[PDB]
Amino acid sequence: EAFTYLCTAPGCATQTPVPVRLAGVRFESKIVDGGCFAPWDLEATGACICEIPTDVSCEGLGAWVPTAPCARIWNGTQRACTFWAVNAYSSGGYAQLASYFNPGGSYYKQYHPTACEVEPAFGHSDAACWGFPTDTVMSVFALASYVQHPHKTVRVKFHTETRTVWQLSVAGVSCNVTTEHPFCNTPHGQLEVQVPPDPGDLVEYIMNNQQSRWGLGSPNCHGPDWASPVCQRHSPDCSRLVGATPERPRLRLVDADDPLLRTAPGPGEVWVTPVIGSQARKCGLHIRAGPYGHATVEMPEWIHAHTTSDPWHPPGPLGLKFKTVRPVALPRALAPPRNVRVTGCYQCGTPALVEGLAPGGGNCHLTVNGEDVGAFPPGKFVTAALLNTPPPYQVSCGGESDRASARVIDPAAQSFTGVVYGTHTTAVSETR
Amino acid sequence: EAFTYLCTAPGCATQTPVPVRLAGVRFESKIVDGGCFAPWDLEATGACICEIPTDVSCEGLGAWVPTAPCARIWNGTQRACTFWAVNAYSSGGYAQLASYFNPGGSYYKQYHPTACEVEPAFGHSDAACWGFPTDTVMSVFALASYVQHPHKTVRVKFHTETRTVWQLSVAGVSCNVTTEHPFCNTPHGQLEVQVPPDPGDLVEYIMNQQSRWGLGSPNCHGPDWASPVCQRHSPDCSRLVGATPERPRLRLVDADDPLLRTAPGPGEVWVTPVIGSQARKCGLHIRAGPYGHATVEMPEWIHAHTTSDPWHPPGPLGLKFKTVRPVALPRALAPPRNVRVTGCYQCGTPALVEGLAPGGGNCHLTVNGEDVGAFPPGKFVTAALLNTPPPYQVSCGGESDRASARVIDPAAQSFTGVVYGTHTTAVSET
Amino acid sequence: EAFTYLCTAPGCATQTPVPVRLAGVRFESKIVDGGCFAPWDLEATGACICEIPTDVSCEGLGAWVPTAPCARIWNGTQRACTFWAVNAYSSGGYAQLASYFNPGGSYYKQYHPTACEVEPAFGHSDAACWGFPTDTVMSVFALASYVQHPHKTVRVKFHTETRTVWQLSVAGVSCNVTTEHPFCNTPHGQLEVQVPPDPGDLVEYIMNNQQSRWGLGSPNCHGPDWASPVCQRHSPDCSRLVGATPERPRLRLVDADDPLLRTAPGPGEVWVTPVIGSQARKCGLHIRAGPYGHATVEMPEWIHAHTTSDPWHPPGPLGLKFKTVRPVALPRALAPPRNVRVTGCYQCGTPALVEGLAPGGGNCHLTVNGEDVGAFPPGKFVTAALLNTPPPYQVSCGGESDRASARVIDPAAQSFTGVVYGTHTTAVSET
Ligand SMILES: *[C@@H]1O[C@H](CO)[C@@H](O)[C@H](O)[C@H]1NC(C)=O
Ligand SMILES: *[C@@H]1O[C@H](CO)[C@@H](O)[C@H](O)[C@H]1NC(C)=O
Ligand SMILES: *[C@@H]1O[C@H](CO)[C@@H](O)[C@H](O)[C@H]1NC(C)=O
Ligand SMILES: *[C@@H]1O[C@H](CO)[C@@H](O)[C@H](O)[C@H]1NC(C)=O
Ligand SMILES: [Ca+2]
Ligand code: NA
Ligand code: NA
């Protein structure tokens, strides 16, 4: 019986009674792939127009609205757009008189269709539009949505049931120690390694060549990591949005001298202010937007400060308990298992069902694509295992492998299982 | 000293030096009862009406609006309803002219009160209503709320401080090993069981009665995002608490409006009149954006996102056989005196347990059979997470006594430290 | 070898083979300082006015609106205010006729600027305003926001990687056992303590003098602790708000006989009702507000029922394993480490980078302001450590200490790192 402490740093080693060297530190986990995450990025554009446009769209407003921002914002999430008539046509035109701008602008929309809201804004300052001989004309357009910038999108994998792996060389023999498997064979005995507890759940931020950054925790959306993209926009299949979503932005036409400008817009609020033109029949637009969560996320900067290059592990040391004890040699079945069926999902957080027939002549130390799922006595077995690998599944008892039958879906498919995505439609018929 | 690995599957057994059989696998935990959970289920109804109704309510609109959906939706959470006047009376009537439909409809509501919003919709297509000889009349009603379907409601218990229980039989003698209690007695020695770590928190989804299991908090940011736990929370299965969606945004959208090229957002309800096959009648097409961008199918979600049993690591267990025998310590068997229990049970906040431990040794205290620790004779005080409701039977290992209790249930705890409902205030004249 | 169970209560002790006494129970953790937390406290005020005021502000409405509530609510978070004209001037006045109250009140605002919304309310009952000789005049003002009451604000520290510390006295010799360090040296040989698992994450609620209250968990915002201020208003620097925020309150003028009053207002909704006056040209106002989360949080009461005076620990007992085995004597470097640099943050949840040069003579059992960060062989070292102490950092191998160079920020600074706070402004120029 002997005892020694082994430090956890590279190069750490003990020589007596048996040479033990710390080869490295890694980890095991049950992966939960969340798909794509990004910040809620409110973006706004518009124009102050000394005219009553007949086509309220990016192409129809091309003479005033910035081209690239309009197209990008138009394609965003929870789009909101308003067209305000500040001073309409006094005579002539085509559905451009003040009478066509009723609340909601249904009269204008009849002749000039648009996906945007149309509202009267008579009474608001028209000072920004000048240089007209008789009839002063003015309108304001505002457009805002939650835009998905590719550089701000991150792939996130949650690591559950985390086990720190202390890679040891015990008298030249490889031994990977964890809280689950803390024993190593020594030349004529056994080494039991006392290890610190596991670090709990980890967050793997995958940047895109491909690089992984690490968070320690769930994460905690109520602490210093509140601005994590995990706390924001969630797309399980990196295409469709699910769960918590901000409301459509609230667009407001605010005059330059309005006392409201002494305060800041709230989250999702967009305040637009016409700017007096230096040129005749032209005007600028000042836009004030309240970002979601009260701040704009800077992706490379957030990742650099809120993550580490490697997963965290406790400082140690490890307690090396050397014993003269030798484990009892048990006979094991080396033949492959038969009629193995795998059902459920992988990298999803819900254990998959693994069932089959273990062969005779000992316990089958079952592996599913090399993943340890436990040992089973001969005959029928059933287990619930958290799988990290996709199908097809190669099943073995430690010897030759066989192909299992599988009905296993991916994490993105699991995220959409048990739900009917999109618009729910219903019809109310006329009475008989 | 001897060592052997014991697998964790049914039928697993070792024979030397003393036989150890894996009898079963269960778990211990500190229960946190969350009450009732359900998805945020947006439901909408309405009618296209070739008339200007004077009573905007389920009964008042009975001739057009479907009866059962109206009554159910009207009683829902965060109800929203709008009555649009598309084409009003040209003459006569009673507060039915276009002039009564000012924005917000205050003039109409003065003579025809309603809990619904009233708005003008002049300029919208009235083509759906035909067959009028001199005065075409049209109105549209839309009603939406977050409805509670009983089949979608689940009872949820969170399991904290989870301890996997490896039920062993050591030469016929029952031994329940956990990370807290890993020692067993063997005929002539002691068995120390090396066990894997505990699985962390569990989620128990209670159907109807059947229990289904989730592993985790749950994680509302991953594949289990649509869990009812991530949605509507009712601690007492009656009153709603916490995060709630806004009232639905109802919009009258004409069949040819370019807005129909896009999908409604979460909580948005777009209604479109459908031309009648009969004179002075019309239909209504409803497009609703569900909360979270998808409609939850309860039996289907539960089947794919839960297991029949709680998860446990694959093992094996490390059986360390020792010739060591534990030192016999004196135990007090008399019941504890003047025991007081204060706080809550199945709530997540440890309850205060205080009393007097009797003489003759340490009192291995149990509260309704739950182990709360051992105490030396005299005054004791402990903070224990209780899983059982009052009354509390207290024992030191022998006879039991009735403790005095001021313990509330999880639903009562959820409403403790808060004043529920509408906050009313009066501003008096100077 | 010998074995005995040791209970975890005060007064617990074992006599044989070596006397062991339970001296106390404490804990170690990696602190995550969240800053300030408070409930979302919706507060509303207003007035029923038998006049058409020309200044819609707290001072301008001083003759009708309660002074202290107006000033407090005006300075609140996500402020909303509406001025409704129920019955305007029939003649005369200054931008007070019905024609100035178009939807949105732009005509009125042109002459009478206000940060509040202005809306017509003609058609609503004006019965509350009576005793006018010829021209009946009536308006209604409502104001609401999320107010920060100092007594409702709590400082919160999240405790991660929690380790219960069982303080023992092994024959008068102090030994602090944890799941990380369960061994005690004895003259016989060694005492190995079998301990229960750690309790998981803790929540430390700091009141005010200064008192700490304890929660067990993350917390769970979906269970009985749903009303925790942690689940509500978050201010990392106890000044600026971040994350999830309710919408601006939805103010509505609701007549006394409106069927809407048979239902309760939703969260963030404020319904105002004029009350018929006993005095001529005067009226009262009844306010119905739907609190955030469907209930108003009572801070001392919530804390008393949802927290404990001390952090929770399992009941035990501890398994005392007495061995004749003596640990192997390893050489330790006692000289201070050289060129130590510390980069990152402390009490933030992100491990800081610690790098330097370990001296000769054995392994350097490195401490950063007394915090154990591991042992390193002589030479260059690099480690990722969760730090609980602020800079400056005193570094030691177990002997004399040296001053490390540091670029370490506080938890409030970390919360604002990687973000640009406030209003995002953009200008669209003329072509
Ligand atoms: C907007 O979306 C449409 C349809 O997917 C696509 O054709 C167009 O190129 C997109 N524009 C931009 C700027 O992304
Ligand atoms: C330890 O882990 C390494 C890396 O995964 C592997 O190559 C080695 O075979 C493992 N050793 C044992 C004994 O399993
Ligand atoms: C082990 O657990 C079972 C089931 O609860 C019980 O019947 C048995 O008595 C327990 N054994 C011991 C030694 O406590
Ligand atoms: C145990 O902890 C106490 C309190 O922090 C301390 O005074 C004592 O020195 C510690 N004992 C050892 C052996 O570190
Ligand atoms: Ca008047
Ligand atoms: Na004009
Ligand atoms: Na008509």
Short mmCIF file of C-alpha atoms in Angstrom, two decimals, chain A residues 1-14 16-17 42 44-48 62-66 103 121-124 192 194-200 214 216 218 220-227 247 250 252 257-260 263-267 269 271 275-280 282-299 301-302 305-308 310 312-317 319 321 323, chain C residues 1 30 32-34 37 40 74 77-79 102-103 106-107 109-110 113-117 158 160-163 178-185 190 192 198 218-219 221 230-232 234 236 241-248 250 321 323 325-328 330 332 345 347-353 363 365 372-377 382-386 409 411-412 414-431:
data_model
loop_
_atom_site.label_atom_id
_atom_site.label_comp_id
_atom_site.label_asym_id
_atom_site.label_seq_id
_atom_site.Cartn_x
_atom_site.Cartn_y
_atom_site.Cartn_z
CA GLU A 1 0.00 0.00 0.00
CA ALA A 2 1.45 3.37 -1.17
CA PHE A 3 0.21 6.98 -1.73
CA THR A 4 1.38 10.08 -3.68
CA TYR A 5 -0.08 13.31 -5.14
CA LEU A 6 0.26 13.87 -8.90
CA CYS A 7 0.03 17.45 -10.27
CA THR A 8 -2.12 18.07 -13.39
CA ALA A 9 0.23 20.29 -15.47
CA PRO A 10 2.10 19.02 -18.63
CA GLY A 11 5.30 17.27 -17.51
CA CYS A 12 3.96 16.32 -14.03
CA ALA A 13 5.19 12.88 -12.96
CA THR A 14 5.87 10.63 -9.96
CA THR A 16 7.71 5.79 -6.89
CA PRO A 17 6.45 3.10 -6.19
CA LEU A 42 -31.99 45.43 -35.20
CA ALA A 44 -33.00 50.33 -39.78
CA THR A 45 -33.09 52.44 -42.95
CA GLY A 46 -35.40 54.86 -44.74
CA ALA A 47 -35.65 58.18 -46.55
CA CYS A 48 -37.14 61.63 -46.31
CA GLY A 62 -34.67 53.48 -55.29
CA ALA A 63 -34.31 57.23 -56.02
CA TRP A 64 -34.22 58.01 -52.22
CA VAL A 65 -33.66 54.90 -50.00
CA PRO A 66 -30.07 53.42 -49.81
CA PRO A 103 -55.66 56.04 -41.09
CA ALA A 121 -48.69 62.48 -40.92
CA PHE A 122 -50.36 65.88 -41.56
CA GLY A 123 -49.40 68.36 -38.85
CA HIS A 124 -45.77 67.13 -38.67
CA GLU A 192 -6.96 3.79 -7.80
CA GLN A 194 -8.75 9.98 -6.51
CA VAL A 195 -9.96 12.70 -8.91
CA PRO A 196 -11.64 16.12 -8.32
CA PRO A 197 -15.35 16.47 -9.35
CA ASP A 198 -16.26 17.03 -13.00
CA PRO A 199 -16.72 20.71 -14.09
CA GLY A 200 -20.44 20.47 -14.94
CA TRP A 214 -15.35 27.24 -24.63
CA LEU A 216 -18.31 26.96 -18.58
CA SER A 218 -25.53 26.45 -19.19
CA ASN A 220 -26.08 31.85 -17.40
CA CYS A 221 -28.17 34.43 -19.34
CA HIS A 222 -28.61 36.41 -16.04
CA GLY A 223 -24.88 37.09 -15.43
CA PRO A 224 -21.87 38.62 -17.27
CA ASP A 225 -22.52 36.29 -20.28
CA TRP A 226 -26.07 37.78 -20.80
CA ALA A 227 -25.15 38.90 -24.40
CA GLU A 247 -41.97 41.97 -31.54
CA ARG A 250 -42.10 50.08 -33.51
CA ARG A 252 -42.21 56.42 -35.14
CA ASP A 257 -37.88 69.67 -31.76
CA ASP A 258 -40.14 66.96 -30.18
CA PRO A 259 -39.39 66.63 -26.39
CA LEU A 260 -39.38 62.79 -26.88
CA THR A 263 -35.01 60.36 -24.05
CA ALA A 264 -33.53 57.25 -25.72
CA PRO A 265 -35.68 54.81 -27.80
CA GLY A 266 -36.52 51.54 -26.04
CA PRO A 267 -35.54 48.05 -27.34
CA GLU A 269 -38.04 51.18 -31.18
CA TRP A 271 -37.40 56.93 -34.31
CA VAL A 275 -33.14 66.60 -41.82
CA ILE A 276 -33.53 69.96 -43.66
CA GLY A 277 -32.13 69.64 -47.19
CA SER A 278 -29.22 71.78 -48.45
CA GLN A 279 -30.64 71.15 -51.98
CA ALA A 280 -34.14 72.06 -53.26
CA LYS A 282 -34.48 66.98 -51.12
CA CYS A 283 -34.10 66.04 -47.42
CA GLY A 284 -32.07 63.76 -45.16
CA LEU A 285 -33.19 61.35 -42.45
CA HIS A 286 -31.79 60.83 -38.94
CA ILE A 287 -32.51 57.38 -37.45
CA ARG A 288 -32.36 56.47 -33.72
CA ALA A 289 -32.75 52.75 -32.92
CA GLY A 290 -32.97 51.00 -29.55
CA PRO A 291 -31.09 47.66 -29.88
CA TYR A 292 -32.49 44.44 -28.37
CA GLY A 293 -31.03 43.90 -24.90
CA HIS A 294 -29.88 47.60 -24.75
CA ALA A 295 -26.57 46.92 -26.60
CA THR A 296 -25.17 45.87 -30.02
CA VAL A 297 -23.12 42.62 -29.83
CA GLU A 298 -19.59 42.70 -31.38
CA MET A 299 -19.07 38.99 -32.20
CA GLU A 301 -14.86 40.78 -29.29
CA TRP A 302 -17.58 38.95 -27.25
CA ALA A 305 -13.48 37.87 -23.71
CA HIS A 306 -16.31 35.43 -22.76
CA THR A 307 -14.69 32.11 -23.83
CA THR A 308 -11.41 30.14 -23.50
CA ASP A 310 -9.77 24.98 -24.06
CA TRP A 312 -11.91 24.28 -18.01
CA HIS A 313 -10.80 21.60 -15.50
CA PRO A 314 -10.06 21.83 -11.70
CA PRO A 315 -6.39 22.40 -10.64
CA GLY A 316 -5.97 19.02 -8.91
CA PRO A 317 -3.74 17.33 -7.73
CA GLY A 319 -4.52 11.22 -5.38
CA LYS A 321 -3.57 5.09 -4.29
CA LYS A 323 -2.62 -1.31 -4.05
CA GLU C 1 -7.23 -0.39 8.37
CA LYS C 30 -16.01 30.08 -8.22
CA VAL C 32 -19.95 34.85 -10.79
CA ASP C 33 -21.03 38.40 -9.79
CA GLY C 34 -24.24 39.31 -11.65
CA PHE C 37 -31.29 42.61 -9.74
CA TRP C 40 -40.14 44.68 -12.90
CA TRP C 74 -41.46 60.14 -15.23
CA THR C 77 -37.73 52.65 -17.26
CA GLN C 78 -39.78 52.26 -20.52
CA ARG C 79 -41.97 55.31 -19.73
CA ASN C 102 -56.30 64.73 -34.85
CA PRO C 103 -55.10 61.06 -34.30
CA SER C 106 -49.70 66.63 -34.28
CA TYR C 107 -51.73 69.90 -34.58
CA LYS C 109 -48.16 69.32 -30.35
CA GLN C 110 -47.15 71.98 -32.93
CA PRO C 113 -44.89 70.28 -27.33
CA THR C 114 -44.87 67.18 -25.06
CA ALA C 115 -42.92 63.89 -24.72
CA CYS C 116 -46.36 62.20 -24.26
CA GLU C 117 -48.76 60.76 -26.83
CA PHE C 158 -23.83 33.06 -8.43
CA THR C 160 -20.37 27.74 -9.35
CA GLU C 161 -18.03 24.69 -8.89
CA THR C 162 -19.34 24.62 -5.26
CA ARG C 163 -17.35 22.42 -2.85
CA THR C 178 -13.66 18.48 0.22
CA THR C 179 -14.39 16.24 -2.81
CA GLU C 180 -11.17 17.79 -4.30
CA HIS C 181 -8.98 17.28 -1.16
CA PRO C 182 -10.36 14.38 0.97
CA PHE C 183 -7.08 13.34 2.71
CA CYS C 184 -5.75 14.17 6.24
CA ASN C 185 -2.25 13.33 7.52
CA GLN C 190 -3.39 8.75 6.52
CA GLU C 192 -9.22 9.34 3.74
CA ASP C 198 -21.30 18.74 -3.69
CA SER C 218 -29.45 28.42 -10.99
CA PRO C 219 -32.18 29.66 -9.98
CA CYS C 221 -37.27 30.63 -13.13
CA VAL C 230 -32.75 37.23 -10.86
CA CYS C 231 -35.59 36.20 -13.26
CA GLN C 232 -36.42 39.94 -13.77
CA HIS C 234 -30.71 42.85 -14.60
CA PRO C 236 -24.57 44.39 -14.17
CA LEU C 241 -30.07 47.84 -17.79
CA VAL C 242 -29.25 44.84 -20.07
CA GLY C 243 -31.15 41.93 -21.69
CA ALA C 244 -34.88 41.06 -21.51
CA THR C 245 -37.07 44.14 -20.95
CA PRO C 246 -40.91 44.55 -20.97
CA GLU C 247 -42.50 46.70 -23.70
CA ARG C 248 -43.58 50.28 -22.88
CA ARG C 250 -50.10 50.05 -22.94
CA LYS C 321 -11.16 5.55 6.45
CA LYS C 323 -4.94 3.84 6.95
CA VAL C 325 -0.14 4.31 4.56
CA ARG C 326 2.28 7.29 4.61
CA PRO C 327 2.35 9.76 1.62
CA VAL C 328 5.60 9.92 -0.44
CA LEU C 330 7.92 15.17 -2.85
CA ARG C 332 8.65 21.59 -3.27
CA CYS C 345 -11.53 38.93 -15.56
CA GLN C 347 -15.71 36.81 -10.42
CA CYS C 348 -16.99 36.58 -14.05
CA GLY C 349 -17.25 32.86 -14.90
CA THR C 350 -14.57 32.97 -17.64
CA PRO C 351 -11.20 31.47 -16.55
CA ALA C 352 -8.37 34.03 -16.58
CA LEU C 353 -5.01 33.21 -18.20
CA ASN C 363 7.05 21.72 -8.08
CA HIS C 365 2.26 24.96 -5.69
CA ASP C 372 -4.81 27.49 -5.35
CA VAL C 373 -4.39 27.31 -9.17
CA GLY C 374 -2.39 24.03 -9.31
CA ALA C 375 1.20 22.76 -9.08
CA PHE C 376 3.75 23.27 -11.90
CA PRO C 377 7.20 21.72 -12.61
CA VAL C 382 0.30 28.45 -18.56
CA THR C 383 -3.06 27.86 -16.81
CA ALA C 384 -6.72 28.91 -17.11
CA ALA C 385 -7.97 29.76 -13.60
CA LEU C 386 -11.30 31.05 -12.28
CA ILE C 409 -11.26 43.63 -15.48
CA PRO C 411 -17.49 41.55 -13.42
CA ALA C 412 -19.39 44.78 -14.38
CA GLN C 414 -16.86 41.98 -18.35
CA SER C 415 -20.69 42.27 -18.70
CA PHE C 416 -20.14 45.27 -21.06
CA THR C 417 -17.16 43.73 -22.95
CA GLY C 418 -17.99 42.61 -26.49
CA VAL C 419 -21.01 44.99 -26.71
CA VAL C 420 -21.61 48.65 -27.73
CA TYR C 421 -24.16 50.05 -25.25
CA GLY C 422 -27.14 52.28 -26.07
CA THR C 423 -28.91 53.90 -29.04
CA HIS C 424 -27.61 53.00 -32.51
CA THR C 425 -27.77 56.09 -34.75
CA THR C 426 -27.62 56.29 -38.55
CA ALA C 427 -28.02 59.11 -41.07
CA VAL C 428 -29.54 58.82 -44.56
CA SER C 429 -28.14 61.64 -46.70
CA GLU C 430 -29.88 63.40 -49.64
CA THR C 431 -28.75 62.14 -53.11
#
